[PDB]
Amino acid sequence: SMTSHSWLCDGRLLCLHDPSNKNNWKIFRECWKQGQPVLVSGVHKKLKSELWKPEAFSQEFGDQDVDLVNCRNCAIISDVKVRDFWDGFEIICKRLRSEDGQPMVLKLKDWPPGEDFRDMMPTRFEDLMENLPLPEYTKRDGRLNLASRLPSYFVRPDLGPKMYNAYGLITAEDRRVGTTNLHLDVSDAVNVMVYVGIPIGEGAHDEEVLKTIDEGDADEVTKERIHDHKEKPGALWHIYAAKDAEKIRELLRKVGEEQGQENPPDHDPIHDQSWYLDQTLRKRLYEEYGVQGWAIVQFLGDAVFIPAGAPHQVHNLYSCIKVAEDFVSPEHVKHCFRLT
Template sequence: YNYGPRGRDPLPIRIMTKTESSLLYPGVAHSWLCDGKLLRLLEPLAPGNTPLFQDQWKRGQPVLVSGVGQKLNPDLWNPQSFSKDYGDIKNDLINCLTGNIVPNQPMKKFWEGFEHYGKRLKDDKGQPMVLKLKDWPPGDDFAEMLPSRFEDLMSVLPMGEYTRRNGRLNLAGRLPECFVRPDLGPKMYIAYGSAIHPNRASTNLHLDISDAVNVMCYVGVPKDADYEEHIKEALKAIDEAGCDILTRRRVREKEEIPGALWHIYHARDSDKIRDLLNKVAIERGDKLEPHHDPIHDQAWYLDGPLRERLYKEYGVEGYAIIQCLGDAMFIPAGAPHQVRNLHNCVKVAEDFVSPENVSYCFHLTQEFRHLSDTHTNHEDKLQIKNIIYHDMKDAMACLMAASKEIQIKSEVEESVEKKVKESDS
């Protein structure tokens, strides 16, 4: 690492080929997407994954892990099981086409329309809505409300030392029991597909204060609509999204089911993205309000023309990634990203705080303080200062204990050596 006036400089982005990485990490099943920038691990629970994962992660690069879904219990993650178990619960839904909230709807109605276009809730014009269920269950512990699904997910979640609540490399797990635990999930993100609605996001451009892993547990296509048309539109969206040739081949030749289209950018490029979005807003005649932020406000989706301007005017190129059924997407803290569901998706996300990105977590907390008091991110819900303090305290305790052991061992050896010399004399 190099250290500048503002602290540690980020490591340069690494671009690899399979030939190079196979020599450095023999025996690790993997490939490279996004022209060599995106690591794709192929065996989610293989112990040899960690060094390769860490070498990408410390550079602030996202990682894709495939094969997680093959280890999940499929009976727990389909629409029918959710409708049966939680259909009577009411929840607010979001219309992805307008951003409007559809309040207090029985979950059964949402699930009935998940794979049946004709059963979907309709808007004021009588058109079926593209609905999203975000951050569910709200305010409840996933482990308590969905215990069987929690156990199933935790048993297959890759990079467990980072992603488990008690993982050694999940710094959030070091908070003492007397503290209110930050809500790091898991949370479910379930949305209808929008392949036939170009440039409409399931989740607009935003960034998160912590690291996250997002698992695609189920992908469905409407059974009462034109199946071939939906597949065709999804493939068209992939072709227009800037995906590399290997990604496009994956969803065509490998017959994998594409669920969501992601665009992820490096955390270090956030200010350039903000600058572009503010510039575009001014060009459109919008007024820039104080204490608001174009990324944190989640008001933008970077479509093709905006992504092209970002590259031409700022030299910023992100990752165009297709998350297929069973893929786990690792997103570093502070990395701006947006998601568009091509088909109907059931996703589960777990947040964590890794040593590699804790500095971004801290700086983002400071950044959020400048947002308006009404902004959802204004408050430090992560308690990052408490996390850093107690992690440092535990680390120092371990170092002091190890140092004391070494000192005692050295004193014992000196004492034995002295006695041997005395006996010899």
């Protein structure tokens, strides 16, 4: 039977089932006011799927110049063509190679650049913004979005959306690396999985995806979504409550010292965006600092709501296209205020 919602993370995570339900706000707002993230499934079924394929991004924009990042080592690959990224998205043999002659795991940096999404891709912008869940919170002019209503005493987000495009991580060594490192934002965000590309040529790395989710600390209901429904899994997230950020800073300052980094006692390891919390660091955060997170697997069409001030990291299981919009909910406006 169709249901309004379910729970993940052993009851700590709301999952809404109908992205366009005019009553979602009544369930959402009680979880959101406590500083929890929220998951909304099924947004892919509202979108024009032909607008979100990698082949169409290559055909229409392939001649633009861009930089990429090598996710394994943080190296920047300067001033290449955007088709060099898209044409290897799903076909491994077509990927750029490192000196070792392996195909690289790559992320496309800042594309479309700055606030240009709307200008470059007007039809995609319409399709996304018209189908965001919780529209009174997430639309530019929604009645519960304060982004356009605050004076300069508050940090206001840029005009979005922002696109996040990157290959999936592959090997047992890759399990310790991020697509996006641990960091926080002063605004609220909604991030949608609009496309998941499951490769071919070295397509058979299905078993290291299972070990990654297991060791990622995912719940038994999330493990059922794979085996039972055959939905396409994109990315493994870890999110932490805004109130735990300083304990996470304290762990990461201790670890930097142990690893002979040399840093002033005040420096901000979260703001540096230089860390990925692997199984060892997550266990140490729980045991030694008493901090528990939410481990979330974002499938095709899932929308992740990230609260202002919440530290978070992302690890792509397969090749993904994500589109995110920032907003300022009244519940969390404290987090972008410039005083006390």
